[PDB]
Amino acid sequence: IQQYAREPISLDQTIEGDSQLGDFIEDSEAVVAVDAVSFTLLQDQLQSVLETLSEREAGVVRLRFGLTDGQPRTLDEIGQVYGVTRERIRQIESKTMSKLRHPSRSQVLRDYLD
Amino acid sequence: DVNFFDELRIGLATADDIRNWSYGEVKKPETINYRTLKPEKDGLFCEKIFGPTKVRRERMGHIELAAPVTHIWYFKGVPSRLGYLLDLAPKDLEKIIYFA
Amino acid sequence: DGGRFATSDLNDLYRRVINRNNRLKRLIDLGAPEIIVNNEKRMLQESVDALFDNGRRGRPVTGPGNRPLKSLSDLLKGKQGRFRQNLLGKRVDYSGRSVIVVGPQLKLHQCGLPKLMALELFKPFVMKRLVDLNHAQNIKSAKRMVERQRPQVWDVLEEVIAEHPVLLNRAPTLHRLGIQAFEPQLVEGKAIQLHPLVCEAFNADFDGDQMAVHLPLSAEAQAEARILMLSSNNILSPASGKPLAMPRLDMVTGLYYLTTLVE
Amino acid sequence: FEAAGRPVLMGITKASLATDSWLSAASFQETTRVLTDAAINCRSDKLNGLKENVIIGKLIPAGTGISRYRNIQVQPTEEARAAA
Amino acid sequence: NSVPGAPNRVSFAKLREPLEVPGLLDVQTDSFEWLVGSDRWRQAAIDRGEENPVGGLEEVLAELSPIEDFSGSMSLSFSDPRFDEVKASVDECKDKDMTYAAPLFVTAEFINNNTGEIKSQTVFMGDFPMMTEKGTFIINGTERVVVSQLVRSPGVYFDETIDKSTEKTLHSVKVIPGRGAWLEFVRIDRKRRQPVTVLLKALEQIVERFGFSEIMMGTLEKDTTSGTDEALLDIYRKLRPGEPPTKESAQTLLENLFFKEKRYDLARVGRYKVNKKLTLTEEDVVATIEYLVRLHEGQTSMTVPGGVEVPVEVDDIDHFGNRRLRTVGELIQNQIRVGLSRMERVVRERMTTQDVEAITPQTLINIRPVVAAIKEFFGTSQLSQFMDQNNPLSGLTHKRRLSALGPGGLSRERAGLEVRDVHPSHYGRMCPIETPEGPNIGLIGSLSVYARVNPFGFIETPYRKVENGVVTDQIDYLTADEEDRHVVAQANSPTDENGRFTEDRVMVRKKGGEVEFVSADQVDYMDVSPRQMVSVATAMIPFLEHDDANRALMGANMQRQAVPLVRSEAPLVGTGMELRAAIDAGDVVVADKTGVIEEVSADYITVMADDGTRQSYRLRKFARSNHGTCANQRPIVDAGQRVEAGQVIADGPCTQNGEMALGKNLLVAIMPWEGHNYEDAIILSNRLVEEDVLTSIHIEEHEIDARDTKLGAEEITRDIPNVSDEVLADLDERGIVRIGAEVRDGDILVGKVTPKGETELTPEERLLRAIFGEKAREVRDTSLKVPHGESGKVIGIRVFSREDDDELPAGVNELVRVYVAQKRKISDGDKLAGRHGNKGVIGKILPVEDMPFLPDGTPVDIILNTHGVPRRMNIGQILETHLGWVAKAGWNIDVAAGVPDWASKLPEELYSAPADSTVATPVFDGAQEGELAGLLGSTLPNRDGEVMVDADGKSTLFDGRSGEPFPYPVTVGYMYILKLHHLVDDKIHARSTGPYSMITQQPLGGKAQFGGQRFGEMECWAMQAYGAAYTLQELLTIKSDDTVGRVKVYEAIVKGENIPEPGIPESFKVLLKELQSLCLNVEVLSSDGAAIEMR
Amino acid sequence: SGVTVSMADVLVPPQKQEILERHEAEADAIERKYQRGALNHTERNESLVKIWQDATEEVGKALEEFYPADNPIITIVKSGATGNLTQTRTLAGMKGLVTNPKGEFIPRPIKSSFREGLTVLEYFINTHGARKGLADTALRTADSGYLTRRLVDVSQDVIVREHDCETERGINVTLAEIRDAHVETSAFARTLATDAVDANGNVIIERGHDLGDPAIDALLAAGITTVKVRSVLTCTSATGVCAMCYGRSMATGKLVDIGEAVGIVAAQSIGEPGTQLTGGLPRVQELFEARVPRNKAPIADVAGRV
Ligand SMILES: CC(=O)O[C@H]1[C@H](C)[C@H](O)[C@H](C)[C@@H](O)[C@@H]([C@H](C)OC(=O)C(C)(C)CC(=O)O)CC/C=C(/C)C(=O)Nc2cc(O)c3c4c(c(C)c(O)c3c2O)O[C@](C)(O/C=C/[C@H](O[C@H]2C[C@@H]3OCO[C@@H]3[C@@H](C)O2)[C@H]1C)C4=O
Ligand SMILES: [Mg+2]
Ligand SMILES: [Zn+2]
């Protein structure tokens, strides 16, 4: 209750001398240029890995995470496009993921971890 | 984003201009819920009109007044723009607009 | 942070207007004596007036502590009004400042730049060339490298700073010679080494005096710095034509003693 | 203007407020009075002064911002490209 | 002398000090003790002055008692304030972030006249903040000081004016009360030229009693109103424009306005100002009119009927007799009065709606206003200030400071320049030399050394009365008014056997005050000492009489800017005030009882007195001051030493052996040196780095809290979502940095985490999570890291936890504070300065090998440019430079037969002196030129028979770089210089990219946000003058405000591409919207005339 | 150079003890005139100030005669590097008359110098003029900045738009009607509107020339006194001004470039001074604002006898 009873304060208020409070608030969602570029450089690195995978394999990984469409897709929904049992899609996913963990393919993205 | 445009023009905004700009009429004097802290609907931060939580900086609202109102700039600015347009003494016009 | 909330006065000003507007609707629908309705209409008009230009007509609306609320007019008008505080004057990236120290060993076109300041200012530039070289595999490695001040970055910084001009400025800026371009020199310490001749133009005495640095980025910006605002190209004061980089106190007595004739 | 007229002497503050640009006069002094008179007169700003361009982010019409200077075309001479 | 510590410092003064410096902290303690009414002040008033004193609290309680009903049926009486022992110690309050206070009970009573019942009760007002022994308040853990405020003395003030055009002598007068509207002569409270006759009509034979003035009858003849009620309507229409008068309202109008306490607070000071000039009484208003009348005639005497006569002249508002300062005790009293008055209203309304016989003193009283008035004042008021603690001298001048601005005083803008000027009445009360150098000149000033405050709020000055040409030992503290009533003899006056004047005539100050030369018979009072006009800080500048007020003002301001050094060496050439200022500052450990030391430890020291009772003193070791300076204390006594009451046991931060040591003694050479010292710059020996002489410790306090958020509770933890184990290698289990660990900018102090949801991670990111098997953590990393450029080691950690029963604000669970300190070697760019207003940055630091050095091989520590010395009129710095060498080298006058003719006035103790002796030259009677040259002629060989400095204070120095000597003898000496709180490490800022404001898209300035530099209005003018359109556009579009432009340029720089074309400044787009919000339709238009969507 | 400051280098002239008493004695006699009452009181102060502010000049020359030309303090001032003779007189010798807070000269002078050290009353009196002067330089910057801003805004759009407007109009510079005190600011750096003609006769400098230093002397030799010169006042340029009318660029020392924004350069050239202005900033604002003069002076409405 004592947290609810707190009353707000004015940004237009000034604090020492001639400086209004409002000028000190950070914009959190403002794009940070150092990360957005690396994100573009990151998605180019992933585009390389997909060419190494099988055409059906690369197509599955995207749809599962919806890299091109921007929306994930469940296995049964990935089965309709490829006309295969959803378990097979789970199997293809497992084999392709382990191959992505293979030493050669993932060496570059380790540094891109954070 | 052209960055090369010729003229910049200013003029009185009619009620229809204001009416047109607005993406909705704000109906309540509510800012945000006190528990969820999320914007209150039909209020001053209503996402329905202003935008989802870059467009939240671009969209505007409007308030429909149950009684007309004079723009203080044109009445109290010296010399009184209304006072010279209707030929009313500014001290007289103050008595009319503010119900004296 | 601290969970507490802050908000512009405009919200309370809009809150006053919409409150009285709705109450008016309520009074009309009910049907109310003309005194009550007219009283509400006057109140509504005053709220819109306070919203636009508060205090312009009579009592200004105040919040806690009796401070008057900031109207829409207050956004545009004052020294904090947009035209002075934001439109013409605004803070910029790729800039820094520090206290200045004498640079007697400098050439007229040179300025001493603290290595730490020159690093952060040029941070993207050194990040780029250090990824060109195989020192860093990707950008995030370069950024981590610079922030930890890895010793490999120093020799790189000299290569990126080479023949890249920087603008120096001291407040207050009375004339254009208050901003002049220089060639940066990586120097030690956290002070800025200033050529003793430009002191006359900047009105800079070395008692805690601080100057600001600006990094021209575009090709046109660097061209204007090297051509228009170069230190050694602006000698005469563009008011009387008299020389400003002309020697002063210390150097005057030195040359006076040097050429004086003793019987 | 060049219906008779006489030469007029006016101070800098009064002469600057009479400039043909309305946002320049607004950014100088008494923003409210300039805006009200400009909105009524339905004035339009050619955006040709230098303070105006500064506000909107355009190149100032001076120095390297002049048209004759910014529209320059730079190419090596036919003789130069050959020598390489 | 007269102090047990008594460090031997020889004085050059020629006049004994008749009065020791009063305790210069008395001003703060005396005012506070008057408010609380301590027994110490109670017995002092019984001894002198009132038989029964009046406590400030009792004074405000006598005003409210009794609260009487409109009917008077129920009357409630307040009385007998009660104070309980303090809740916690000052050290405990500063620890737990609570205010040092003592609860305050009262003894009220409620009587019903109808039923005659008596209801007594005990009422708790609230926690009443108390004043420490150092004269400071602890408000929420922060040490605060309440500065006394200069305000006009409530009363009447006649001012003569000359009409602009008619040039006929006009006279206007104002009556300024403590509360209520003000009257001006009848213009009343902003209504121009009410007829002067209507006011008495509001209250016969008006002509007959005032027939002396011819003009007063002319104005009356011009007054149209006739009668008491007919003209009271005339005066009514202007006070309340729009109210139809009532027959009753007309008569209550005039009396309710100015003559009853409800709307006219009778000023206790105001009641005394007008009583000496001639609640409010109508007869007094009349007496004011005829003074105006009598003063327009120019007649010098006015006799009010039934009262003693006074002179009739124009008053000076700046004269310290009509200008008072509200001291701390009264500043609290006024805020207590306001809290009790709003309580009066609630008690009144509470009486009505409450049932009769159902009310007790407790029911009628809600204290919310009272404790809110106390809290708001200490918390918000301009007068309650954050104590500046960088050095003990600064905290001593923060107290004893008087400023005119604030609530109730003149505003910061509207204050005229005539009040800023010094005043003849200021002599001995307010220091004219110490005042801010900026826009606050004349508004702020420190109390003089010997000054004392009057119970009525006027400053007094100590004087020695002189009669029949003889000076008696009686001392009278005389206020400014009484000072104009006597002839004040000058401090230095020839002295002979008993009291007789050695010279024929005396130099004195008159009532002007004007300087004059008069007979010895006329003089009545004499100055006690010659520093009466000087304050504490100003009195610490040696050779003050040789420096212009400009540089002296600067020198006084910079002493309070020094920083405590680790070594804290005392000044070789100083004045008398060095000792007393340190002990009275409170940062030194003083023994209050004569005894012998029992134990000596770096932690504490115990002393056994003759009583056998043990006293013990715990030492501040590395306590962080409010501005980051080190407050370390160190003991100066050994185990078995015998000490006397009032002696110094331990040294403070900037003290040594009892006297303030704000800087160090350095070997100086006044030659210009290859331009490295040029335009006030300075060069130093690297010795000052190696030997840590100018090294000063600086501490910083960091803070982070774990609260309960809406999504989850913040947890201080060592587990961080995405970090290497190495960045955690210095953290403990909880996640806070371990004690003694280092910190580099960007390192982690306290690991904190907060809930994050909904995640909605990136499709590109979610895959990397699946490949490398790192689960996307459910929470966001918000940890406490070290600020950019800051470095050092961790001293200690304070932790307050919700689990343990710690007190926290609602929603806050855990609080952890990390204290980091760092050693600051004196560095290039740091700011140094002497006591004479000379200042400059360190341009370069040279190796000790290549430095101008004496034939000893002794290198100079510092080299000062010659050109800055002559022009600034601070040549007192050259004097202490000569004396500085004398003190460190010693001397023996070695009279051939007797004292050479120069030393006629020199004391015998100054004839001989060994090396490294300290010297004292009080400001206005210190060393003089003749004595200095003679002392320069008496010098001692360094080690060998060789003498290193000649009779005019110069030496042949050898260039350390080339090796060949310097052609001309160069002046060398020892100068006392200070390290100032302006340091490079704190003032260097650099930014490439960082956070941006939320409303405007520009970088937010200040060091708190890694901010960028401001390119202001004038700077744009310079760029436009150069014609650099692209440079200007770049600064205002893609460096600050282009949301898309600034991010694309970064992408271009990294990729090494060309820099893109700028966009539209967000500031401009915001401008368009702000115009639309004003109902202004602005349209950007192309050649076609078509509107353009700004998006 | 071996230039240092020392107690010895600051020498007080020995002719100063007598000189004051000489002037002091002239004060007891004006006390006779005051005690006689033949002259008013304000005249007493006046005669006191004129005699005292004379002694200041006498100790000035007295000081200079005593100093060796190689004295380090004098060498600093002689070279022009830094310093004033007024400051040297206040260092050794006597301070002189100081200001009262109200603004009127005290009749009582400060006979002591900062070398000998002032006394309690002498130091106190000087604080009035020292503080009042330190506050004058405090608000001086605020008014100068507001003046510079109005200068900039009224002239910012004035830039050079063309090489030449080919107008023949101009203004006549006085040019040594002995040389005129200030031809460097009026005639130097201008362009000739018309050919410079000698009687009857020979043309010494053709029009459209820069008027360098050698031009002046050569001109000066021919016996000419006045010259018609191009100016932006007479420039017929449609937009902005032309290069030939504006003339040399003070910075480049050559003809002004086309793009130069001379309006801002002028506003700043006039704006940078004003911190040095102490008959000052009020008069300058009165002129540019074109207000009715503070104390109006009449001009002849027609030529003729008076
Ligand atoms: C929070 C706080 O304590 O700030 C304090 C102040 C900064 C600290 O006390 C500070 C430690 C200061 O004492 C020292 C420090 C070394 O000096 C400085 O910091 C600077 C850099 C400025 C100067 C310098 O260093 O060179 C020492 C200064 C030494 C001298 C001869 C001096 O100049 N003294 C001084 C300086 C002032 O400017 C004011 C001042 C003022 C009043 C009524 C005063 O008497 C002032 C005063 O005597 O009215 C104004 C408009 O506004 C009021 C502003 C603040 O008052 C608070 C009061 C309340 O506390 C919390 O909520 C309130 C808050 C909002 O305002 C001021 C009074 C204002 O400018
Ligand atoms: Mg400076
Ligand atoms: Zn022209």
Author numbering:
A (entry chain F): 351 to 365, 368 to 466
B (entry chain D): 3 to 55, 86 to 132
C (entry chain D): 331 to 593
D (entry chain D): 1187 to 1188, 1202 to 1283
E (entry chain C): 21 to 205, 215 to 232, 237 to 311, 323 to 1139
F (entry chain D): 726 to 902, 910 to 1010, 1027 to 1054
Copy the relevant paper text:
Kang A and Rif were soaked into crystals of an Msm RNAP transcription initiation complex (TIC). Both structures were phased by molecular replacement using the Msm TIC as a model and refined to 3.05 Å resolution. As expected, the Rif scaffold of Kang A binds in nearly the identical pocket and pose as Rif, and the interactions between the RNAP β subunit residues and the Kang A/Rif scaffold are nearly identical to Rif, including the cation-π sandwich. In addition to nearly identical interactions between the RNAP β subunit and the PK backbone of either Rif or Kang A, the chemical moieties unique to Kang A establish new interactions. The K-sugar interacts with two β subunit residues that do not contact Rif, R164 and T424. The K-acid also establishes an interaction with RNAP that does not occur with Rif, a salt bridge (4.4 Å) with the guanidino group of β R604. We believe this interaction stabilizes Kang A binding in two ways, first by forming a favorable salt bridge between the negatively charged K-acid and the positively charged R604, but in addition the salt bridge rigidifies the side chain of R604, which may stabilize the cation-π interaction with the Kang A PK backbone. Binding of Rif to the wild-type RNAP results in a buried surface area of 2,880 Å2, while the binding of Kang A buries 3330 Å2. The additional chemical moieties of Kang A (K-sugar and K-acid) contribute about 450 Å2 of extra interaction area over Rif, and about 75% of that is contributed by the K-sugar. In the modeled de novo initiation complex with Kang A, the pose of Kang A positioned the negatively charged carboxylic group of the K-acid very close (2.5 Å between the closest oxygen of each group) to the negatively charged iNTP γ-phosphate, suggesting that Kang A may increase the Km of the iNTP by Coulombic repulsion.
